Amino acid sequence: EMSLENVAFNVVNKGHFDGQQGEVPVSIINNTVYTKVDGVDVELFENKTTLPVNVAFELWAKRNIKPVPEVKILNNLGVDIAANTVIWDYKRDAPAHISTIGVCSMTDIAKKPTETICAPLTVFFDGRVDGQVDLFRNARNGVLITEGSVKGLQPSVGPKQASLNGVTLIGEAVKTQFNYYKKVDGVVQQLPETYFTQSRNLQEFKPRSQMEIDFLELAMDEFIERYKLEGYAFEHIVYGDFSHSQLGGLHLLIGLAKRFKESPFELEDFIPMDSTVKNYFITDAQTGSSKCVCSVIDLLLDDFVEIIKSQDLSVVSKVVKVTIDYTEISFMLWCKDGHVETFYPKL
Amino acid sequence: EMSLENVAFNVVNKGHFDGQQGEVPVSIINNTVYTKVDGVDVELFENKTTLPVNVAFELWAKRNIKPVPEVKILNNLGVDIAANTVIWDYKRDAPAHISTIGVCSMTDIAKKPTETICAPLTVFFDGRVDGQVDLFRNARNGVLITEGSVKGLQPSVGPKQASLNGVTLIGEAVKTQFNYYKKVDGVVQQLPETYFTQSRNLQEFKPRSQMEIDFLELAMDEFIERYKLEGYAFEHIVYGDFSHSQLGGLHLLIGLAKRFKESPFELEDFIPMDSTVKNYFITDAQTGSSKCVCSVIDLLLDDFVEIIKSQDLSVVSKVVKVTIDYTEISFMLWCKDGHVETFYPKL
Amino acid sequence: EMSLENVAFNVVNKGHFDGQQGEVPVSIINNTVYTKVDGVDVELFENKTTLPVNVAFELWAKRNIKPVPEVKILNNLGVDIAANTVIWDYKRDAPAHISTIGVCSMTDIAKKPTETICAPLTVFFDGRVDGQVDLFRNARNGVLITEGSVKGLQPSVGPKQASLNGVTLIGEAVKTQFNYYKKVDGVVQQLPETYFTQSRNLQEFKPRSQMEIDFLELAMDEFIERYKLEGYAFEHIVYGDFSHSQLGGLHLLIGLAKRFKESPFELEDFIPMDSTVKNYFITDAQTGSSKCVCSVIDLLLDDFVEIIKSQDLSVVSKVVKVTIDYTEISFMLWCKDGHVETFYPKL
Amino acid sequence: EMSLENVAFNVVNKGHFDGQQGEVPVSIINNTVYTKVDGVDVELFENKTTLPVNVAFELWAKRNIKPVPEVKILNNLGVDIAANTVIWDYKRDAPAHISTIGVCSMTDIAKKPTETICAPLTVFFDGRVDGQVDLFRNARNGVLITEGSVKGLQPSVGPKQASLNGVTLIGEAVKTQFNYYKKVDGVVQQLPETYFTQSRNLQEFKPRSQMEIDFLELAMDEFIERYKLEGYAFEHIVYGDFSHSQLGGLHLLIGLAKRFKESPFELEDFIPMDSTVKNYFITDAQTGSSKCVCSVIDLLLDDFVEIIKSQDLSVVSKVVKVTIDYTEISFMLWCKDGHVETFYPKL
């Protein structure tokens, strides 16, 4: 049975779609799904997508509830569609992909990824599901994740964190560290070496190295000397300059986290989606310094130090390419007299 | 005058419907009521109910602003409807009851509870309103609350807390501890002896006994020994097991509160209403341990200890009945070798 | 180009309307503007106004992103409309003014403030924009703000704080302290001497004098003696009386901030707009004391002390007028035996 | 009482707002007003305006239900707003004017047309309503209509037809022929000598002179011969050319009326409002000849013959001006070899 009342039965009794049999009565009003409990209407789901309410409700109920790669990683690898599952995008509160394969009648383009309409699409496969390693072996364009080794294929070690029901975490009771494989036009690709962003947030920021512990505790001058960062404009790039009306620098998430613990500010996320580089309209409450487009990246500080120290501080300006999250991120390097003025990513 | 503009006049000038005379201009757009202040539109009310916007607005303005029983208590007693008042359900942001008596033309089924259409309904009466003790005396099916004694009737002492404008509190400047009476088919009933849930929330959790103070301070091993809880699986039931992908135990709200103060997690309330037992989709951020349907109850720990110590740990498994909030709650007891495996309620 | 797709191009690339050339594809559904990024829909804007979604979106994108006077100051000065800019009202999440001048085709009543339809309106001018001091000089009815001196005109020093992207702040990297000028029917007016409210909020409250530091630290009895406040009913007016079911006093925002740091309560803002005096439905969680209409003002405590000490405590009751935020605020003074019972503003 | 429930009481018991006292229960959902009749909801009003549903419902209930000038005439006379009434526009299913005077609190700009905000607006006054003639005498800008003489003021005889509850008619039981007066800046104007349109419609077209009777009855050749219409291209202008894929001519409503009874065609009114000139997207069903923009005007056939015979036929292209419905209409006149090629109006 593929029906709205059976989807609602599974949500009410199992928390998500579990393939149980049964029905509950449902009312659809506004963009909202309601169900009746003891004679009163209880909201089950509010549609935030651009899809019909009943279609969005079913896709949400059928979301993957295992640790899955963050949406930004799948976007950078060019994933178009998932084989037999729904990746829910919790930043957008919507499905990550426009179409499905074997999930929902109103959005399926196929029931199996072997159908010819899927061959030109990059299909995401999940080695933890039975038979999907073999489906990837025969797929034309695919991305495969596994927890272990795949016989015949060289792995690429992915990020340590994954997403579990919208929570980004480095797993202890569960595995969040995947191997990645990619096929293009039938040929297995070699994925480039890459840094990974850390997927942390401002208020809950926790360091992941001694350098990041030192950065959050030490005064700015102490930190720069201890790690020998003279001439790299860390005061501008990382700490931020709040002395003028236009906010200077502040392009690393750990810099915002240090400023935020001492002085809260406003972060307007005007394009609310998951991406390697984020752009913010930031307003500093303490000083009134602000910037309309501030580009922020959450690299491990040890990685960002390693990146900026490998730059020729001798030319005036240039665009630098850095592989981060399997994609090439452009950094605008501004130098002056053998020293960095600033160094910031672009979205 | 029973009109939308007069309802809005009372909200703007008195904060709620107070029976004052006057009108303000109103605009209805989307599911929202607006009023004009200094030539600009100000939102008064956003309809979250399944009712028409103007009907929901009036019911909300006429909500009871005194301490009232929590909606879950009225549901457990089988209340269908209130005599001459609106119980607002702040969990659902909607009226607790589908119909009214003497409140609103679009939802009234009668103007007085003495009308014959009310006799088969369990009507909620409030002894703090004049004449309602006598209405209950003549009602066929009713629940009555009072602050003091009723001549002729044996009281049942209710919970210590009540709800005041959506805030659950044990009152000091006001009385929140009611006597309860029930009539069924014309006969006064004897309400059973019962435990009461405590209606606390995760982030604001405050203990209400020495055992709950000890539980929140002591290490797990200390607490279990001090109160002689060996063999009752408190480590599983109350503290929670976060070592596997499937979260074990964790069925008491105080257990979640202890875990939350040290490590925040995600609580998806997929049926958002007031009930004695709640079901949550929980994801632990620190470990990635999760459970789709976790049943949680907020009993005083001294009560839950008293309940579990009265169980025959000798049979393998059985359903136990416990009277809580005037209703019989089923607990699934799993035992092994004269010791509890787990003990959890069901919704 | 005045188009929805070009407005969305500016928002996506510049964070706000910046007059750049370009277009992005847009979908309008519900009351929401979406744009497509990597083939998925991303929400740019949710319309909370009573305007058409595409009109509200453009007005929001064209909001003033400089420090501007708080909306309550412009309302008190009788501003009807802004010359060539949009003042966004972040309390209402809507434009402050119904019409525009040279901003948007669907809301403009003129392209320039010199047009005859503007002459009877009080137009807000901004001296930081070129030519607007001269426009005010020729305007019939206007309010002008500058950072410096205007040749020929006597200034009125305004409040220290202004609003920057919805954040109220006293600026350090930017100027938030303006001079104010007003013209009525062609004649420059003398603005009255006035107190200013402080525009602080409950959870982030920070004192701005020694008396306010003392108030937040000292016990109530210490504070009253030290500053010689016997006979002015500060225990009632400022600290609040929570001993009865009806909450007594508590009309200064610093009083709520002191109570809130020790005991959280509920503040229902039933008319959500910016005004000098606010009215709240307050419920105290600790005691259950509550009041449907509690009028709160955020004066500097040194100012409120200075105001109440200048009152004749000899009459029973009267309405006192006080100039605050350029408007006359009525205070109901209740006295008994040469001492204040209470002293509260009215909205 | 000014309230939604009282407006719906008048609509239900009197067909429109008559100022009776009483209230009926009302539900508002979608953009529709409903009322309960014997326990079921009956729709009273569907909102087709861009106003809030309850505002539009009130303006519709208070529409003028006497014969009023057609909206096109008031527009051409520059009317901005009506004094103490609502002119409903039945083509648009919406109020003719954006604001009101003493009608509705949410749309009024004044309670009387003597208030200074109304002085720069051209206000419509109805001499059939008491005191309105004197309001006009004092007004600055206005249009006055009367049935008979006004002292001191020279009348202009308007059209014979008026609109009554949406129906255009020349009245027999009631008077539809009005005298017109216009003031601009306190000075009475001479209204120019004008032709008027006949406000007819295709499907139920009816001739109004012998020549029009001749036009629908006689063959095209007999007609052009009889009234000496050689060289004026009536075959093209009035009868229309359906031989090519682009429909030629057909710029007079009586012409379309003749073809319609002969052969069906579709008229897309892509700007549905009342104007002297209309534009249509016309698709002829028998031949497939069609034209995206066909400009149609409904003059008395004898009036239109009198017009094109007052033309100088020695110009390859010129723009003629005719006073029609008190406004100037641009006709494009193509000529070749001293004879007309075509002659059509401009919207």
Add this chain to the structure above:
Amino acid sequence: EMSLENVAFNVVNKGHFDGQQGEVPVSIINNTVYTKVDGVDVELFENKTTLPVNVAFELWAKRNIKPVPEVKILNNLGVDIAANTVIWDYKRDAPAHISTIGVCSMTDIAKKPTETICAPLTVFFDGRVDGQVDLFRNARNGVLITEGSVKGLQPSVGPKQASLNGVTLIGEAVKTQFNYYKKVDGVVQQLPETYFTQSRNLQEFKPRSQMEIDFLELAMDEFIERYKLEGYAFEHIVYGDFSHSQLGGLHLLIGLAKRFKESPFELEDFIPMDSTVKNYFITDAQTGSSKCVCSVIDLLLDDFVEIIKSQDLSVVSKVVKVTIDYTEISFMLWCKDGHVETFYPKL
């Protein structure tokens, strides 16, 4: 410029999108597009599609306004998408196809039909537009229509009628008879010999042969005698049986046309789209005979006689296949004693 305001400029000044430069102000509210004409909002477009209102408005403005094949023909030919145009479906009031090619940024899958995503799609090419014949020559899957010969390709003569702005017509001023060509995997196909339907409608039905003139004029008996139609159950199949509560027969549009002028009935089109076979819920008003599912096909009466006379009458039930509108139609043929009982199409 690709923008909503420029689309509405073309609609307002040209009746449809003509690629003119300019913009008009637009308001979007509900599912409707409005524009201001002299200070009041005029509706331009109501969205009846499942697309976002602004997307649907653009596709409608860019619809093909030349004679195009009827949607049913394209569906039967397997057309997936049109090359560089919008085929509007006037039955559904929506685009015929889900995606576009070089039309609209929110719906395009490509800018040209040469892009590899279009190769597996059956693309409709219009030989009246320049270069489209060659695009077809190179395409992998496609349908081509022309007015005249194409070199090397053998034509298939399609129907005589086409659709022009929603009106089905056999063109006289314009050509509606197309040659058809179909490629599948780069190989031109032989289109099968087919009958075509006449696309007529009841109320304004018009005979198209002597036999059809005979059918509407003569009595049923004279008709069946004249053309030798004994044993074929024309009284049942074509004329219909209204004697029982279940309506018998009546499977030909000309048959319904005859009854309609004789006696009114209601046809519920419970699947409102264009197909060779239609199903209706029919309720005969004079007798009360009715049928939930009545399958109606509109063949030329002489074509349908030629069909049922090519049948073997010695089978109790068989499924006949007729090529109609380039597709196969299943007719169920009941027979008994060597004569027809009924013969009706399948949807």
